[PDB]
Amino acid sequence: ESRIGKQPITVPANVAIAMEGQDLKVKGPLGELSITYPREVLVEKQESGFLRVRKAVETRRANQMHGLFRTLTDNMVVGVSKGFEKKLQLVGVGYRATVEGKDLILSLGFSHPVRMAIPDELQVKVEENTKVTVSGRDKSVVGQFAATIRSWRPPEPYKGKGVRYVDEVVRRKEGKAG
RNA sequence: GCUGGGUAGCCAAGUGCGGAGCGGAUAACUGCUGAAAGCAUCUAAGUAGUAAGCCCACCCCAAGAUGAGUGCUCUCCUAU
């Protein structure tokens, strides 16, 4: 009954499929990844472009785990090819996010500017000093480091100050009790 | 006997020193990816921040730790 799982997995152009025993070796054009799979879930390669994954109705991983697994390789395979990106609008008085080599320098106005270290493989675009957008590969490992920048100053309820999700509509409560 | 001084020792009111870690796992909490439930959701797989609290680390003891550990070195002649 999985309405995401019933949909076949779109395998785009230049998808390097391979097996490491139980893992699906997702190594497209830009690099490499790793995805492990249980004994109750055999991922089929049905010899017709598309891909669908097997169930095993003893527990209800047949219901639920195929939400993760049949959407993991949706984003893992695309992720190596294109890459998923998350966006950051910084708003306020003197909010620079310049980049000196490896680390960032977010000078939000604490005292010492905040040097968020750029991790192993990922790279980050920088629209201006005023705005940033983090490119990458996967959806998971990009989102954590993206969320760490949003953590330093959340979107605040009076001026909409500090960091912002570009998509998110954060409220502005009536400041000064006006 | 009563006073006035006082080296060493012992004493403080005197002199030194101390409380430190970008180490680990957590609690409330904030999350990322993400179904069940085409959407959502911090969770059911996985994972990140994250406390004078908990565990290592500091300092003293410690193999009677009968589970008696490990290392280096010395000694085994006779009435002595």
Are residues A130 and A51 part of one domain? no
Domain stops at, among A38, A68, A83: A83
Are residues A45 and A65 part of one domain? yes
Structural domain that includes position A41: 1-83
For A25, the token pair is: 């070796």
Domain stops at, among A30, A57, A83: A83
Are residues A98 and A151 part of one domain? yes
Say how far apart CA A89 and CA A125 lie, in whole Å.
13
Nucleotides of B under 7 A from a protein CB: 22, 30-39, 44-49
Technique used to solve these coordinates: cryo-EM
At A16, which CATH number?
Answer: 3.90.930.12
Are residues A59 and A139 part of one domain? no
Amino acid at A71: T
Residues 6+ apart with CB under 8 A from A109: A92, A93, A94, A95
Q: Any idea what DSSP says for residue A65?
A: H
Q: Is the C-beta atom of A66 closer than 7 angstroms to strand B? A: yes
Are residues A171 and A100 part of one domain? yes
Number of folded domains that form chain A: 2
| Distance measured from the CA of protein residue A102 to the C1' of nucleotide B53, in angstroms | 37
Closest CA to A36 of A21, A18, A15: A21
Find the residue closest to B31 using CA and C1' atoms.
Answer: A147
Q: Any idea what DSSP says for residue A19?
A: B
Where do runs of H (alpha helix) occur along chain A? 61-81, 140-152
The residues of A between 124 and 163 with beta carbon within 7 Å of nucleic strand B are 139-140, 142-144, 147-148, 151
Strands (E), A2-110: 86-91, 96-99, 104-107
Say how far apart CA A139 and CA A63 lie, in whole Å.
23
